[PDB]
Amino acid sequence: GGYLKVKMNEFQVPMRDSMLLSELKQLITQKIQVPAFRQRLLVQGSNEVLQDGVPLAHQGLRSGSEVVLVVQSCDRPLSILVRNDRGNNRAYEVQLTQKVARLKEQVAERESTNVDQFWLSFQGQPLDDEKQLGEYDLTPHCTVQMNLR
Fold first, then answer.
1. Rounded distance, CA 99 to CA 118, Å?
2. Of the candidates 37, 45, 38, which has an alpha carbon nearest to the alpha carbon of residue 66?
């Protein structure tokens, strides 16, 4: 029977024993279709930012408490990692609406390689040059792998 009130527009979500921030964000994703990375949650009134790993009930919340949800705009850039053939990483700013081809060009320049000599993969799936990055579910500081031809 416990719940939290989420204030963006307002809705309720169930609050189970020892619920974590990641579970609150999952319930919010199910309600409003916004990924966890675009969500920031704060305790209402005081405005304390909620954190991972510690039960929400131990961050000043209890059943019936209100939390403030801030949604980051979908067009804000995010940083990702591209890992090369030697397992070395570099960080890249991207927009999810950019085509994969644009990321390939960034990587080719920074790795001193030609675009036609490699392809990119995410969690083992190849990235299609013609698709938008947002077709793949990239998140901040996730890893895209280079694959040499």
1. 16
2. 45
**By C-alpha distance, which of 52, 77, 81 is closest to 141?**
81
By what technique were these coordinates determined?
X-ray
Alpha helices (H) in the chain, listed in sequence order: 21-32, 100-110
What would the two tokens of residue 58 be?
């131990």
Nearest-5° angle of CA 73, CA 56, CA 35? 25
Neighbours of 53 (CB within 10 A): 7
Resolution, angstroms, 1 dp: 1.4
Tokens of 120: 């990119």
**What whole-number distance in Å separates Cα of residue 42 and Cα of residue 46?**
8
